[PDB]
Amino acid sequence: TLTARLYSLLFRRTSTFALTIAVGALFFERAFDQGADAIYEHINQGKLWKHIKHKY
Amino acid sequence: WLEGIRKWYYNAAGFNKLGLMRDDTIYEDDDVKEAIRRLPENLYNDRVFRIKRALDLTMRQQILPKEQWTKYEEDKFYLEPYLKEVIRERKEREEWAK
Amino acid sequence: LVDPLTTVREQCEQIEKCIKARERLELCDQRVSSRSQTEEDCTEELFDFLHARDHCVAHKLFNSL
Amino acid sequence: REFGHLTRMRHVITYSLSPFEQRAFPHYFTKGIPNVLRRTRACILRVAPPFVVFYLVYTWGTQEFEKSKRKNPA
Amino acid sequence: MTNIRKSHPLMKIINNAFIDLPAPSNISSWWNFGSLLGICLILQILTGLFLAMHYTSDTTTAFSSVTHICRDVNYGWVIRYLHANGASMFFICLFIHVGRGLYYGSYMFLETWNIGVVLLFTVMATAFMGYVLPWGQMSFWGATVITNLLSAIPYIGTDLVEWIWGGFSVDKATLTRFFAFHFILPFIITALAAVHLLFLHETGSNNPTGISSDMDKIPFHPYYTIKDILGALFMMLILLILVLFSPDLLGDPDNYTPANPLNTPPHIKPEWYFLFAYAILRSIPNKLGGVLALVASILILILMPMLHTSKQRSMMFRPLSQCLFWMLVADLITLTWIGGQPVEHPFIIIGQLASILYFLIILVLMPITSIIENNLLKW
Amino acid sequence: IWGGFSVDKATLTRFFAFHFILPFIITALAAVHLLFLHETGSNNPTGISSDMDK
Amino acid sequence: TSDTTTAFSSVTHICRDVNYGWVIRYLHANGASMFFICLFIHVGRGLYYGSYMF
Amino acid sequence: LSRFLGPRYRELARNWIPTASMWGAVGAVGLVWATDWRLILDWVPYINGKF
Amino acid sequence: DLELHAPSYPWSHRGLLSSLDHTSIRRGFQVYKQVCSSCHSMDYVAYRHLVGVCYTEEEAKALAEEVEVQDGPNEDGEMFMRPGKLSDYFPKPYPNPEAARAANNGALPPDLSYIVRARHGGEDYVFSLLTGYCEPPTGVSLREGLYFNPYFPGQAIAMAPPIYNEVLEFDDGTPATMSQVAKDVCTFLRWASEPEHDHRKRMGLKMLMMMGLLLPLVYAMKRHKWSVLKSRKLAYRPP
Amino acid sequence: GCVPIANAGDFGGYYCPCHGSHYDASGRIRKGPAPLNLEVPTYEFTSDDLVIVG
Amino acid sequence: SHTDIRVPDFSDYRRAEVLDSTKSSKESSDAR
Numbered sequence A: 001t002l003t004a005r006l007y008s009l010l011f012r013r014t015s016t017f018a019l020t021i022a023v024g025a026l027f028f029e030r031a032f033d034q035g036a037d038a039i040y041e042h043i044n045q046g047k048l049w050k051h052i053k054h055k056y
Numbered sequence B: 001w002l003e004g005i006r007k008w009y010y011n012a013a014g015f016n017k018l019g020l021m022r023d024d025t026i027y028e029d030d031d032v033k034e035a036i037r038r039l040p041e042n043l044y045n046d047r048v049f050r051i052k053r054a055l056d057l058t059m060r061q062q063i064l065p066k067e068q069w070t071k072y073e074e075d076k077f078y079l080e081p082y083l084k085e086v087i088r089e090r091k092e093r094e095e096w097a098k
Numbered sequence C: 001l002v003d004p005l006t007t008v009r010e011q012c013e014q015i016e017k018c019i020k021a022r023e024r025l026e027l028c029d030q031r032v033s034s035r036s037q038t039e040e041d042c043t044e045e046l047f048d049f050l051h052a053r054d055h056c057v058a059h060k061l062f063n064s065l
Numbered sequence D: 001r002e003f004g005h006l007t008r009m010r011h012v013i014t015y016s017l018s019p020f021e022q023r024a025f026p027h028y029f030t031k032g033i034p035n036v037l038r039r040t041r042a043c044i045l046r047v048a049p050p051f052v053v054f055y056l057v058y059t060w061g062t063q064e065f066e067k068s069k070r071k072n073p074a
Numbered sequence E: 001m002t003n004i005r006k007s008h009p010l011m012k013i014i015n016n017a018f019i020d021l022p023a024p025s026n027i028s029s030w031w032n033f034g035s036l037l038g039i040c041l042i043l044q045i046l047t048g049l050f051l052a053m054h055y056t057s058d059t060t061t062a063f064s065s066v067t068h069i070c071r072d073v074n075y076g077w078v079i080r081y082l083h084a085n086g087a088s089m090f091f092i093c094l095f096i097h098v099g100r101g102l103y104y105g106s107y108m109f110l111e112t113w114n115i116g117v118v119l120l121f122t123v124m125a126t127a128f129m130g131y132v133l134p135w136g137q138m139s140f141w142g143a144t145v146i147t148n149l150l151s152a153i154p155y156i157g158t159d160l161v162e163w164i165w166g167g168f169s170v171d172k173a174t175l176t177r178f179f180a181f182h183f184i185l186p187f188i189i190t191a192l193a194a195v196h197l198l199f200l201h202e203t204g205s206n207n208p209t210g211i212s213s214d215m216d217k218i219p220f221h222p223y224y225t226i227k228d229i230l231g232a233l234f235m236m237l238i239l240l241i242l243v244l245f246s247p248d249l250l251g252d253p254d255n256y257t258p259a260n261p262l263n264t265p266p267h268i269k270p271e272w273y274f275l276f277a278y279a280i281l282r283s284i285p286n287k288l289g290g291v292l293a294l295v296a297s298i299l300i301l302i303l304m305p306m307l308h309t310s311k312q313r314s315m316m317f318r319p320l321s322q323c324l325f326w327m328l329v330a331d332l333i334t335l336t337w338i339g340g341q342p343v344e345h346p347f348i349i350i351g352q353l354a355s356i357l358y359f360l361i362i363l364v365l366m367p368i369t370s371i372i373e374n375n376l377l378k379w
Numbered sequence F: 001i002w003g004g005f006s007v008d009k010a011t012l013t014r015f016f017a018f019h020f021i022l023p024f025i026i027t028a029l030a031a032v033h034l035l036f037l038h039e040t041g042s043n044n045p046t047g048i049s050s051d052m053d054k
Numbered sequence G: 001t002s003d004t005t006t007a008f009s010s011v012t013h014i015c016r017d018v019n020y021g022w023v024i025r026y027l028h029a030n031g032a033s034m035f036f037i038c039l040f041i042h043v044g045r046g047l048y049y050g051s052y053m054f
Numbered sequence H: 001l002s003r004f005l006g007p008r009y010r011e012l013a014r015n016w017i018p019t020a021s022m023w024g025a026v027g028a029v030g031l032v033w034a035t036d037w038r039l040i041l042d043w044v045p046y047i048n049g050k051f
Numbered sequence I: 001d002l003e004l005h006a007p008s009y010p011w012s013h014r015g016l017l018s019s020l021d022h023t024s025i026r027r028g029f030q031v032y033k034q035v036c037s038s039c040h041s042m043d044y045v046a047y048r049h050l051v052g053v054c055y056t057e058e059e060a061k062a063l064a065e066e067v068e069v070q071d072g073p074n075e076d077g078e079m080f081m082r083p084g085k086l087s088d089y090f091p092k093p094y095p096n097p098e099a100a101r102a103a104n105n106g107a108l109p110p111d112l113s114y115i116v117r118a119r120h121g122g123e124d125y126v127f128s129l130l131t132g133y134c135e136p137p138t139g140v141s142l143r144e145g146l147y148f149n150p151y152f153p154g155q156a157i158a159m160a161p162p163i164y165n166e167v168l169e170f171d172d173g174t175p176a177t178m179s180q181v182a183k184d185v186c187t188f189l190r191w192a193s194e195p196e197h198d199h200r201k202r203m204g205l206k207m208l209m210m211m212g213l214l215l216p217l218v219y220a221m222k223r224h225k226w227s228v229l230k231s232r233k234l235a236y237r238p239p
Numbered sequence J: 001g002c003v004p005i006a007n008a009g010d011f012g013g014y015y016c017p018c019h020g021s022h023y024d025a026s027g028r029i030r031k032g033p034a035p036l037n038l039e040v041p042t043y044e045f046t047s048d049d050l051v052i053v054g
Numbered sequence K: 001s002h003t004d005i006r007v008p009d010f011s012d013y014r015r016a017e018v019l020d021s022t023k024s025s026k027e028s029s030d031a032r
């Protein structure tokens, strides 16, 4: 199973657990920030400063 | 008749739904631990298991099935004779004190 | 320049609630006007009309703006 | 109060299972919804009436303020 | 040779106070509020400090400094509104905690109950002095009214009021001493909370059933750490919703006006969590009687362990007592709403009836009803 | 730490806030100090254990 | 106050205007020195009689 | 509560009334001295000159 | 007595995750520049806050350079004029607060830095109050120099009617109809009261997603650890 | 303070007819939702140029 | 009497992997 391989490759050791958490947070911060910012800009398209900097 | 109202209140209280009996829910005031200590072994064991089961049920927010409810006529006041003696002894000590 | 606010007022004064508020308003108007020494003010019925009209106006208007 | 002199038990057996063997959501909706409905049925006839009469009082007072506030024909 | 967790002195105290503490197995979600308040307290302190580093407690600059915090300090607005709405959450959790204690017969713990009453009084004082600091119209005038309340006490009266004022009325000196008292008090609250926990631990905790749970105690760490963490996450959800979606939901707009002593705002109401007292204030025509009723409303919690007559500790098996308690809660919301509203014919009578009912339920209805229940249950 | 580019209003206000809070931390640490001390008892000038003469 | 514009003046207002204010101000100022005198003597006592073994 | 009172408690009260009254006098004197209560202090002879 | 509460207008930012229409913010700043700043004042916000919100840096510095601002002591201690910079707060039309009352009938124009967040009702009030002027009803005479406005408490404002159609010319070229001017200036005032509005909504979106992620997982962890106790089966076997 | 008629008016030196709260020569409000008249301060009247006012 | 002690049926709670009584537990321990 994929989950079993993930466990007894990268979850058994608590120190490996911490390393996994650290790298996962490193990537998750970027992914979540990008996604949330894209969604928020999509909702208010044309109503933010970044959408009207080109005009002026 | 008053017994109808007593039955209604017994059903409304809900401690029977947990399998408990009247004396299993009494607040343990200073007289109550002494009364409990004087209980015979078998009554004490049954009481402690019943209370443990009640706590188990309330942790899961569940009740006993309708069949296993302590009916009002089957409820026994096991503690009452001991509690009366403890209270009487306390009253006698107080009367001698004054 | 034709203000969209004025046109919204015009079409939104047709709502029958506005109709009753307005007719009550003149029913205050002639009563206060004819009565020389009276302290009554038609601000009450005017406020009723203003509320009834402006809720409707708030529903409309911003779409045109 | 530390473990060891809490109480006295005899002839009590507790069977339990590992958290890694059970499902953390065993019949979450199959059994949970009936239990929540039963609990609501047991409690509502005692909790609701004071709040509904509070709502009646609140509405009555809120309407009472205006007509005392309203113009008196005179 | 021995585990550090239960051999090192500080570690031993932490272990037998938060890790290996035997707690009842069936404590409901309400008990979680005990943790939340403490967390709120930390959230009140840790955020509050960061406001003290850009707030100048001077009349000429207090409001301007707060506006500077919210408009120019990097992420300052988050700190300010987090603080305000967290104080509101603190009072919400405090009221729910008192309700839990009253409901499930917890006031038999006596010492913990009295320490809790003292903590409650200290928290209300802290919030009162806190609201003044922004030096808005409502802040200034609410401080004026609440301090002028103390003029009702006989003899000393005006002298005590001016002593608090540091002058003839509220002014720069009053603002400064309010800021200093506000800074010091929460640490006293923290010490008192430590004493509260110390007193509580000697006897354990009251489970919802009210019976002794010595036969079902479980270690604290595996279960209740994560349970209270879930509770704190829920409280953070509510608090963050309040801060980031309606920051001024529980807040008068007029506090965003610089305090002008020459204009009385049309409405003078305290914070939302004081209205229940203030409404009682409005109920009693006599000023001295009003102040005595205001203090007695909170002081009545001390009488509760003496006013309990039912032979059942909890309220879980007591229906009529439950109905009475929920009527009491509804009366509390009624008092809050009445205090919010001004003082006219529709509200005066309602306030009088609400105050009378609030005292009557605690002092009369609840004990007599407990007697009725004991008689009805053959004991 | 300056809250800027020199010692100014920001630094003064932060210093006031930290000066306010810190002594309470000192009080807590002093309580911990006394706690740690009591598990072993005070040391006499002679250095020898004073368990017999207390 | 904790503002650059009204810090120093405020302190003078403590010494010159507050009833019995100079006594509190100079009590703090000199109590700091007493605190440090006692702290240094305490550290010296710890060094001398080997109390650092705790 | 009614559990008190009776024979033994009344002579306890009588025995402790002198001490309790002396403690009340102690409190009264300490109060009037601490706050410099004028109303009383324009009557005691030598301290009248304080004001 | 009586007061008329403002109707809940459908503002662009009324939405739970909506943002101020920054083009309308720019137009509203124009309105404040050539209408409200003449007698009304705004202090807590400065030209610096304009960048990245409604004006670019060049436009903001030009706007600051247009006005004249008093500075500190001269080489001999004089009060020399100076072209305003980006770090300058919006000039106050009247030097002392009493001079504002003296120039007017006697009521000072409140500062707009918080008027949206200080008036009960919000923009709906400030908008409607501008677009709510009407002839007084019969039977209520107003003093000379006073004006009747139903939404203003007391129904007696000291404003000359500030906003009327074709008062100013927007740089964009949108029609200058009175309703448009009122809406744009109201949006600008909302921005003035809450500059962090858009950032607050963005962080709120992030918080909503983060909690919708965390709460199920933490609840799952709680269920996992508590499942030892929620599945225990007791038994009693007395002799 | 809605544009009062200070030192003038049909009544005495005070008048504020923005609202129903008018005034009088003694300051009494003729009508209006004003809580009271123009506020009277406690004046320990010795005489002119001797009266104590706050 | 110790022989009479029998663990009640927990099959209502056991996960899908550890459900059969003749399939060991080590093979699915990693996955669970």
Ligand code: HEC
Pocket (backbone or CB within 6 Å): I031, I032, I035, I036, I038, I039, I040, I104, I105, I107, I108, I109, I110, I115, I119, I126, I152, I153, I156, I157, I158, I159, I160, I162, I163, I185, J002
């Ligand atoms: C132009 C775009 C505007 C906007 C948005 C506002 N004003 Fe004025 N204003 C003036 C005076 C004398 C007063 C005092 C009247 C009183 O409050 O009694 C005001 C008041 C306001 C308010 C406060 C209303 C409230 O609810 O208290 C608001 C929100 C307001 N103004 C907005 C005078 C003038 C004036 C020339 C004398 C001009 C031009 C403006 N105002 C323009 C505006």
Ligand code: HEM
Pocket (backbone or CB within 6 Å): E041, E044, E045, E046, E047, E048, E049, E050, E051, E052, E055, E066, E080, E083, E084, E087, E090, E123, E126, E127, E130, E131, E132, E133, E134, E182, E183, E186, E189
């Ligand atoms: C017991 C917990 C606390 C409560 C209930 C509390 C309550 C309050 C309240 C209600 C306000 C007004 C907020 C506003 O109107 O915007 C406030 C402001 C303030 N509090 Fe606290 N507070 C607490 C703890 C603290 C602590 C520990 C500090 C110091 C570190 C502190 C410092 C301040 C400061 C400086 C302000 C002014 C900032 C502002 O304008 O909001 N508070 N507090």
Ligand code: HEM
Pocket (backbone or CB within 6 Å): E030, E031, E032, E033, E034, E035, E037, E038, E041, E094, E097, E098, E101, E106, E107, E109, E112, E113, E114, E115, E116, E117, E119, E120, E123, E189, E193, E196, E197, E200, E204, E205, E206, E207, E301
């Ligand atoms: C400063 C705010 C307070 C804090 C931080 C606090 C802290 C705590 C904590 C952590 C608990 C254990 C958790 C729990 O049992 O719920 C607790 C229990 C308790 N508190 Fe408080 N408390 C506060 C206010 C109060 C108040 C106002 C009262 C009532 C007067 C009170 C009375 C009690 C009682 C009776 C208990 C025991 C409840 C039980 O275990 O059954 N506390 N307190």
Ligand code: HEM
Pocket (backbone or CB within 6 Å): F026, F030, F033, F034, F037, F041, F042, F043, F044, G039, G042, G043, G046, G051, G052, G054
């Ligand atoms: C915040 C300031 C401090 C306070 C309030 C404090 C408090 C105390 C007190 C009351 C005692 C017991 C009486 C005594 O033996 O002197 C003590 C003992 C001691 N303190 Fe401190 N202390 C402080 C600072 C320090 C410092 C700076 C050190 C050295 C790093 C220190 C190390 C010790 C030692 C070694 C003892 C034991 C002395 C002995 O047993 O003979 N303390 N402390």
Ligand code: FES
Pocket (backbone or CB within 6 Å): J001, J002, J003, J004, J016, J018, J019, J021, J034
């Ligand atoms: S302003 Fe003078 S009474 Fe209203």
